[model samples]
Target: TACERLHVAQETQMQLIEKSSDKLQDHILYWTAVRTENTLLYAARKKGVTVLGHCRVPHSVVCQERAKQAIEMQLSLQELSKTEFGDEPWSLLDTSWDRYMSEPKRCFKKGARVVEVEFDGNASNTNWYTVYSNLYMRTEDGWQLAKAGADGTGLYYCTMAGAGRIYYSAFGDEAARFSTTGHYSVRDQDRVYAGVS
Candidate 1:
């Protein structure tokens, strides 16, 4: 029973580590990153002397993962569009066979802004989150906005015309009108920041 208690306590600690905020979360993640096979060296430091060791996950890994997911989602959306249109013929931009043939690329235009969606994963069975586009991509030097082209682009552009029903990560029951030329600023409810750019 005592050994079982140790296991349970460790499990609870792991959950707490997940839910912890600020300093506790920082300490947990920091120690997680610093942990290594060299336990004896760290133990020696704990006894009297001091030693420092740290390593970090590469930013490229993070960027690549995000890009990979974005690409996967886009492919899924393309399939969804095909299924919904069937014999009618449609593009990610619209259900016009004529334009779909000629102006095949109706990507969300450059300068378009995308906001993160909010929803309860438990409450919603909708796979709407998969519909959102990646606004930025990691390039050779740094982060850059996704583009539209025949050469393959990372960003998903807005559909068809001047303005239309744009899906916000499919969280809503339906799409909403998002303008291409407008400055809409959102307030931070947490009070930590005044506004979003």
Candidate 2:
């Protein structure tokens, strides 16, 4: 069994290395405007880096005046991933529309309370977390501010007109989570739901 544990650890490391390698390659290719595989040598650096996992958490204050350019560009999920992780976006974003459609019930609800905004606190830059109070019906067009607190006594009115799909607008950047970051995954938690009905 000792050998099995070693095997698992080794396998995980290999996968992490491969993933990091791809991300590094994407960065060099995108920024330098170069097309070469020689960069893989540097990709090995992120193999087991912990920051790679917590790359997505909002660490600093909300610099609305000078937030990351990701907000100004409004990139798609794939674009955000490529931009942030330097790794390609999960293919599932493109090919798994049916899956999301089937799981409409799992989306955040109007009355849901945010138990935790940054759950795993992983700087994954790829995925962030937000726990809601109580799940409610999906708003039709945009998001309406709701009291995502435990007792539902939070501030922010809910009658605002908003939609459920990911919204993208460079000019009116009010409440977007991820913005366009040169590469992709920009439209991660972008949604504007209506007030609780």
Candidate 3:
């Protein structure tokens, strides 16, 4: 996959930021070069391993929410080092986060009406419109369709509000919120386009 390729490319790039480099030797004047390099090497190994795991899962079945959670953890770990070491040690980690962000597409199959468990900035960007066409779901209760108008809006809106409560109190992953506004609904736009599920 492209992500796998990118990961390899990033690994190669990290090799150049060594003790011999003037930029690193300058930082080494204050920081211990061996220890700092070890810290960076540890983080780089984890970043590459995590991205490799993400590549194993197919896009459709891979949980976007979980992937983001994993990425957040990686970012958090990197941040811990950054707080003590500063930006010079985090270039690869920062790039890794950006690559993960660009790789996932928040999309679903046609005739599908779904709710995202993961929060997406694009979902609330007003520039994007998602259409639910002849969309229905077969659940244990019965066939269900997303409600329209105020009542439906209230349901999604309210659910997201409730999710916020749990997130703050327990889960605390802000990216889990379901955004109701800003995401416009197209009544029947692009109804015939079909892509990989």
TM-scores of the candidates are: 0.18, 0.16, 0.18
- Screening candidate 1 with a backbone cut-off below 3 angstroms (N, C-alpha, C), the clashing residue pairs are 107-157, 108-157, 108-158
The sequence of per-residue lDDT tens digits that candidate 1 reaches over residues 1-197 is 42343344345545545655333223323222222212323333345433322322234444344344344434433443333222332222232112222221322212222323222222231111122222222224332333321101111234333343332222122212332222222211222111111
Compared with the true structure, what per-residue lDDT tens digits does model 2 show for residues 27-103? 22222211111122123222422222323212223222122222222222224343322243222222122322222
Q: Give the Å error, residue 64, model 3.
A: 1.4
Please give the lDDT score at residue 184 for candidate 3.
26
lDDT per residue as tens, model 3, 19-119: 23333223222123223323333444445543343433223223343344444434433433333223233233222323323212111112224222222
Put the candidates in lDDT order, highest first: 3, 1, 2
Off by over 4 Å in 1: 1-17, 20-129, 133-136, 145-197
| CA lDDT for candidate 2 | 0.27
Best by TM-score: 1
Model 2 per-residue lDDT at 4: 41
* lDDT score for residue 117 of model 3: 24
C-alpha displacement of 176 in model 1, angstroms? 28
Superposition error at 115 for model 3 (Å): 40
- The window of 10 residues in a row where model 3 has the poorest summed lDDT is 165-174
